[PDB]
Amino acid sequence: SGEIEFKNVWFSYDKKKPVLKDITFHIKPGQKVALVGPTGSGKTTIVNLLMRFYDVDRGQILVDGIDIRKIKRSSLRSSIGIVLQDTILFSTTVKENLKYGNPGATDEEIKEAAKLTHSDHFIKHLPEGYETVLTDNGEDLSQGQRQLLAITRAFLANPKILILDEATDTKTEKSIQAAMWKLMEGKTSIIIAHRLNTIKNADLIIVLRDGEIVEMGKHDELIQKRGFYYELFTSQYGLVVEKEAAGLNDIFEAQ
């Protein structure tokens, strides 16, 4: 499960000017994949089509080898876990928030899920623990804690596929990174990368520009190619240092 393939996909919301043009790629089960490129390059539209918020105008999208137009749509969408940078929670108990994608979960399954995704500790130390009401939709929690909850929430729903918007706290980021790691374990992950920090180890990087894939591959190979990915990466992570080099001086001499 978690196999994804776009074959010659074209799409437009307008049905006038296109947004995606001949998009073709294949993702093996369990691979971590990064989408990179400018705003409006096709990143979000690819994910909208995967969720089947719309059907493609041309080509096909296959999940596990089946055109998603022949898959039960709610099961397709249900099998996809979404973690964005800003998570909205309901003004209810933590426990009920955690059952968002798994209403049938037992109290034991919830705590087990939270232990594996390293949110159990901070939940327990909320004033009412798991029964703490997240008044004002989670705004008494820090940014990090909301993200932990969203990761545990996804984990509990056991998705086959993840869609993750990469962030653009030391005690927390360590546990968030551990949490993400566990959440991604054994799953196909599609990361909308921005900082490009994480994705050095991505199994596949897809570089988009004006609705087309201009490059595709691993970090090392894309860097050597000195194309668009090289440009976006080194512009962001280039580092200026000092080096000793030959120069000229006008020194004093006799005669």
Tab-separated table of all heavy atoms in Angstrom, residues 160-195:
chain	number	residue	atom	x	y	z
A	160	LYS	N	-2.100	5.399	5.414
A	160	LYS	CA	-1.139	4.733	4.549
A	160	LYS	C	-0.168	5.758	3.956
A	160	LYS	O	0.937	5.423	3.544
A	160	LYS	CB	-1.853	3.989	3.419
A	160	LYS	CG	-2.901	2.974	3.869
A	160	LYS	CD	-2.260	1.803	4.588
A	160	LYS	CE	-3.302	0.794	5.037
A	160	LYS	NZ	-2.656	-0.328	5.769
A	161	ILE	N	-0.611	7.009	3.911
A	161	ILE	CA	0.056	8.072	3.174
A	161	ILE	C	0.019	9.350	4.004
A	161	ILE	O	-1.016	9.685	4.577
A	161	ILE	CB	-0.635	8.332	1.808
A	161	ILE	CG1	-0.654	7.064	0.952
A	161	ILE	CG2	0.028	9.470	1.071
A	161	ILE	CD1	-1.524	7.175	-0.301
A	162	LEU	N	1.138	10.058	4.067
A	162	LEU	CA	1.196	11.325	4.780
A	162	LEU	C	1.415	12.517	3.860
A	162	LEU	O	2.203	12.457	2.918
A	162	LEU	CB	2.319	11.307	5.813
A	162	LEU	CG	2.311	10.172	6.825
A	162	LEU	CD1	3.520	10.306	7.715
A	162	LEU	CD2	1.031	10.213	7.628
A	163	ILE	N	0.732	13.609	4.163
A	163	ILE	CA	1.030	14.883	3.534
A	163	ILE	C	1.422	15.867	4.619
A	163	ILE	O	0.657	16.130	5.541
A	163	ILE	CB	-0.152	15.419	2.725
A	163	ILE	CG1	-0.495	14.437	1.606
A	163	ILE	CG2	0.199	16.790	2.132
A	163	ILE	CD1	-1.827	14.711	0.976
A	164	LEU	N	2.640	16.380	4.507
A	164	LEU	CA	3.265	17.159	5.558
A	164	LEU	C	3.788	18.459	4.984
A	164	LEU	O	4.542	18.447	4.016
A	164	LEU	CB	4.418	16.378	6.193
A	164	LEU	CG	4.144	14.939	6.624
A	164	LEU	CD1	5.435	14.219	6.988
A	164	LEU	CD2	3.189	14.919	7.787
A	165	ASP	N	3.379	19.577	5.568
A	165	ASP	CA	3.927	20.866	5.192
A	165	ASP	C	5.079	21.181	6.139
A	165	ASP	O	4.887	21.319	7.342
A	165	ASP	CB	2.857	21.961	5.237
A	165	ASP	CG	3.310	23.252	4.577
A	165	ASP	OD1	4.088	23.189	3.604
A	165	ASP	OD2	2.884	24.335	5.031
A	166	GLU	N	6.277	21.267	5.577
A	166	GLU	CA	7.506	21.456	6.338
A	166	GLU	C	7.527	22.836	7.001
A	166	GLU	O	7.195	23.840	6.366
A	166	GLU	CB	8.701	21.271	5.400
A	166	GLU	CG	10.075	21.192	6.034
A	166	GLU	CD	11.186	21.268	4.987
A	166	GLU	OE1	11.233	22.259	4.223
A	166	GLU	OE2	12.014	20.336	4.922
A	167	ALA	N	7.902	22.888	8.277
A	167	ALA	CA	8.017	24.157	8.996
A	167	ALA	C	9.007	25.119	8.323
A	167	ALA	O	10.033	24.693	7.792
A	167	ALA	CB	8.430	23.908	10.437
A	168	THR	N	8.688	26.412	8.343
A	168	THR	CA	9.544	27.435	7.736
A	168	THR	C	10.254	28.290	8.785
A	168	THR	O	10.805	27.775	9.761
A	168	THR	CB	8.742	28.369	6.803
A	168	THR	OG1	7.739	29.062	7.557
A	168	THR	CG2	8.076	27.578	5.690
A	169	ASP	N	12.418	25.979	21.935
A	169	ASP	CA	11.750	24.842	21.316
A	169	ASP	C	12.662	23.619	21.300
A	169	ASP	O	12.313	22.579	20.741
A	169	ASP	CB	11.301	25.195	19.893
A	169	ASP	CG	12.466	25.516	18.968
A	169	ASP	OD1	13.595	25.723	19.463
A	169	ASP	OD2	12.246	25.571	17.739
A	170	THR	N	13.831	23.760	21.918
A	170	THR	CA	14.826	22.693	21.974
A	170	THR	C	14.276	21.432	22.630
A	170	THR	O	14.438	20.331	22.107
A	170	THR	CB	16.086	23.148	22.735
A	170	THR	OG1	16.820	24.074	21.925
A	170	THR	CG2	16.976	21.959	23.070
A	171	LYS	N	13.617	21.600	23.772
A	171	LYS	CA	13.008	20.473	24.470
A	171	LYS	C	11.879	19.874	23.639
A	171	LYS	O	11.522	18.706	23.802
A	171	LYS	CB	12.477	20.910	25.838
A	171	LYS	CG	13.423	21.813	26.615
A	171	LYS	CD	12.937	22.034	28.038
A	171	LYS	CE	13.861	22.973	28.795
A	171	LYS	NZ	13.560	22.995	30.252
A	172	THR	N	11.330	20.684	22.739
A	172	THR	CA	10.150	20.305	21.975
A	172	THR	C	10.498	19.792	20.579
A	172	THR	O	9.993	18.751	20.157
A	172	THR	CB	9.174	21.490	21.849
A	172	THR	OG1	9.205	22.266	23.052
A	172	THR	CG2	7.754	20.994	21.601
A	173	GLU	N	11.355	20.520	19.866
A	173	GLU	CA	11.727	20.146	18.502
A	173	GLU	C	12.328	18.745	18.445
A	173	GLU	O	12.091	18.001	17.494
A	173	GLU	CB	12.708	21.159	17.910
A	173	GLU	CG	13.406	20.669	16.648
A	173	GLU	CD	14.015	21.796	15.835
A	173	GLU	OE1	13.427	22.898	15.814
A	173	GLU	OE2	15.081	21.577	15.216
A	174	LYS	N	13.096	18.386	19.469
A	174	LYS	CA	13.660	17.045	19.557
A	174	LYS	C	12.547	16.005	19.591
A	174	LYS	O	12.622	14.980	18.917
A	174	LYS	CB	14.551	16.906	20.794
A	174	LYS	CG	15.787	17.792	20.777
A	174	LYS	CD	16.637	17.578	22.022
A	174	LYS	CE	17.768	18.590	22.098
A	174	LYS	NZ	18.583	18.610	20.852
A	175	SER	N	11.508	16.282	20.372
A	175	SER	CA	10.406	15.343	20.506
A	175	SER	C	9.485	15.405	19.289
A	175	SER	O	8.847	14.414	18.956
A	175	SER	CB	9.618	15.605	21.795
A	175	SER	OG	9.089	16.917	21.825
A	176	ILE	N	9.430	16.561	18.628
A	176	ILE	CA	8.641	16.712	17.407
A	176	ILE	C	9.287	15.910	16.288
A	176	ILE	O	8.610	15.210	15.534
A	176	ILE	CB	8.506	18.193	16.978
A	176	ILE	CG1	7.443	18.895	17.823
A	176	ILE	CG2	8.138	18.304	15.500
A	176	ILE	CD1	7.125	20.305	17.364
A	177	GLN	N	10.607	16.004	16.201
A	177	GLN	CA	11.358	15.263	15.203
A	177	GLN	C	11.250	13.765	15.444
A	177	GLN	O	11.152	12.985	14.502
A	177	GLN	CB	12.827	15.700	15.199
A	177	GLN	CG	13.045	17.097	14.636
A	177	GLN	CD	12.465	17.262	13.240
A	177	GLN	OE1	11.316	17.683	13.074
A	177	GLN	NE2	13.259	16.930	12.227
A	178	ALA	N	11.271	13.364	16.707
A	178	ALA	CA	11.098	11.958	17.039
A	178	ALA	C	9.683	11.526	16.675
A	178	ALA	O	9.480	10.474	16.071
A	178	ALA	CB	11.380	11.712	18.517
A	179	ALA	N	8.715	12.365	17.034
A	179	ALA	CA	7.310	12.130	16.729
A	179	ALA	C	7.070	11.960	15.225
A	179	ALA	O	6.434	10.999	14.805
A	179	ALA	CB	6.463	13.275	17.274
A	180	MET	N	7.585	12.893	14.426
A	180	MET	CA	7.492	12.808	12.967
A	180	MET	C	8.107	11.527	12.434
A	180	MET	O	7.546	10.870	11.562
A	180	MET	CB	8.183	14.001	12.314
A	180	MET	CG	7.360	15.262	12.330
A	180	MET	SD	5.972	15.133	11.189
A	180	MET	CE	5.356	16.815	11.269
A	181	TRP	N	9.268	11.186	12.970
A	181	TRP	CA	9.977	9.993	12.557
A	181	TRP	C	9.108	8.756	12.737
A	181	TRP	O	8.986	7.932	11.827
A	181	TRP	CB	11.272	9.851	13.349
A	181	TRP	CG	12.211	8.868	12.767
A	181	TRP	CD1	13.208	9.117	11.872
A	181	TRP	CD2	12.247	7.463	13.034
A	181	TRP	NE1	13.867	7.952	11.565
A	181	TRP	CE2	13.298	6.920	12.265
A	181	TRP	CE3	11.495	6.609	13.848
A	181	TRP	CZ2	13.614	5.563	12.286
A	181	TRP	CZ3	11.812	5.264	13.867
A	181	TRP	CH2	12.862	4.753	13.091
A	182	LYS	N	8.494	8.639	13.911
A	182	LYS	CA	7.616	7.514	14.194
A	182	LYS	C	6.390	7.540	13.295
A	182	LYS	O	5.931	6.501	12.818
A	182	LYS	CB	7.173	7.521	15.660
A	182	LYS	CG	6.392	6.273	16.057
A	182	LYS	CD	7.283	5.040	15.942
A	182	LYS	CE	6.612	3.785	16.489
A	182	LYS	NZ	7.602	2.670	16.659
A	183	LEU	N	5.856	8.733	13.069
A	183	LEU	CA	4.665	8.873	12.245
A	183	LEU	C	4.958	8.435	10.816
A	183	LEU	O	4.114	7.827	10.168
A	183	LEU	CB	4.151	10.311	12.270
A	183	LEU	CG	2.965	10.593	11.351
A	183	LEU	CD1	1.713	9.844	11.814
A	183	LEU	CD2	2.703	12.083	11.269
A	184	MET	N	6.167	8.721	10.339
A	184	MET	CA	6.536	8.411	8.956
A	184	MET	C	6.970	6.959	8.782
A	184	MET	O	7.053	6.454	7.662
A	184	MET	CB	7.654	9.345	8.476
A	184	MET	CG	7.238	10.804	8.336
A	184	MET	SD	8.568	11.853	7.691
A	184	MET	CE	9.822	11.613	8.944
A	185	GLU	N	7.244	6.288	9.892
A	185	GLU	CA	7.771	4.929	9.847
A	185	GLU	C	6.801	3.973	9.156
A	185	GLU	O	5.667	3.795	9.599
A	185	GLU	CB	8.081	4.455	11.268
A	185	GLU	CG	8.680	3.072	11.379
A	185	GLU	CD	8.927	2.679	12.825
A	185	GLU	OE1	9.362	3.548	13.611
A	185	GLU	OE2	8.673	1.509	13.181
A	186	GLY	N	7.248	3.376	8.056
A	186	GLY	CA	6.442	2.410	7.326
A	186	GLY	C	5.378	3.002	6.412
A	186	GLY	O	4.551	2.276	5.865
A	187	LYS	N	5.394	4.320	6.241
A	187	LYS	CA	4.363	4.992	5.454
A	187	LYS	C	4.960	5.717	4.257
A	187	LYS	O	6.143	6.024	4.231
A	187	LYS	CB	3.586	5.994	6.314
A	187	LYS	CG	2.897	5.392	7.536
A	187	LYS	CD	1.921	6.386	8.153
A	187	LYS	CE	1.200	5.800	9.375
A	187	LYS	NZ	2.078	5.675	10.568
A	188	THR	N	4.134	5.994	3.260
A	188	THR	CA	4.574	6.837	2.173
A	188	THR	C	4.370	8.276	2.633
A	188	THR	O	3.299	8.621	3.132
A	188	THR	CB	3.813	6.531	0.883
A	188	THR	OG1	4.137	5.202	0.463
A	188	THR	CG2	4.208	7.497	-0.221
A	189	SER	N	5.417	9.094	2.536
A	189	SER	CA	5.328	10.486	2.960
A	189	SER	C	5.596	11.450	1.813
A	189	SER	O	6.591	11.333	1.111
A	189	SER	CB	6.305	10.770	4.100
A	189	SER	OG	6.012	9.981	5.247
A	190	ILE	N	4.693	12.401	1.629
A	190	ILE	CA	4.893	13.477	0.670
A	190	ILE	C	5.108	14.761	1.445
A	190	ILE	O	4.207	15.234	2.132
A	190	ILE	CB	3.702	13.629	-0.263
A	190	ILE	CG1	3.573	12.390	-1.147
A	190	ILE	CG2	3.837	14.878	-1.114
A	190	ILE	CD1	2.205	12.219	-1.706
A	191	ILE	N	6.316	15.307	1.362
A	191	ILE	CA	6.645	16.500	2.112
A	191	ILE	C	6.675	17.722	1.211
A	191	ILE	O	7.384	17.757	0.201
A	191	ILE	CB	7.988	16.354	2.816
A	191	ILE	CG1	8.021	15.031	3.580
A	191	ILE	CG2	8.217	17.528	3.746
A	191	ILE	CD1	9.238	14.861	4.435
A	192	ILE	N	5.881	18.719	1.570
A	192	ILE	CA	5.966	19.996	0.903
A	192	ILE	C	7.072	20.767	1.597
A	192	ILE	O	6.876	21.361	2.656
A	192	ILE	CB	4.637	20.755	0.931
A	192	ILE	CG1	3.552	19.891	0.290
A	192	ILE	CG2	4.757	22.050	0.155
A	192	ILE	CD1	2.242	20.587	0.127
A	193	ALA	N	8.253	20.703	0.997
A	193	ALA	CA	9.462	21.263	1.582
A	193	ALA	C	9.595	22.746	1.273
A	193	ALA	O	9.244	23.200	0.183
A	193	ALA	CB	10.672	20.510	1.080
A	194	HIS	N	10.089	23.499	2.245
A	194	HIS	CA	10.305	24.927	2.066
A	194	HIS	C	11.721	25.293	2.474
A	194	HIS	O	12.457	25.924	1.714
A	194	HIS	CB	9.292	25.730	2.873
A	194	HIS	CG	7.874	25.469	2.481
A	194	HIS	ND1	7.304	26.007	1.351
A	194	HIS	CD2	6.909	24.720	3.071
A	194	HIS	CE1	6.048	25.602	1.256
A	194	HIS	NE2	5.784	24.824	2.289
A	195	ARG	N	12.105	24.876	3.675
A	195	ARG	CA	13.440	25.157	4.171
A	195	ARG	C	14.454	24.178	3.596
A	195	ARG	O	15.640	24.476	3.566
A	195	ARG	CB	13.469	25.118	5.698
A	195	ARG	CG	13.451	26.488	6.346
A	195	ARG	CD	12.875	26.421	7.748
A	195	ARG	NE	13.745	25.740	8.702
A	195	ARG	CZ	14.488	26.366	9.607
A	195	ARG	NH1	14.470	27.691	9.678
A	195	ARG	NH2	15.250	25.671	10.441
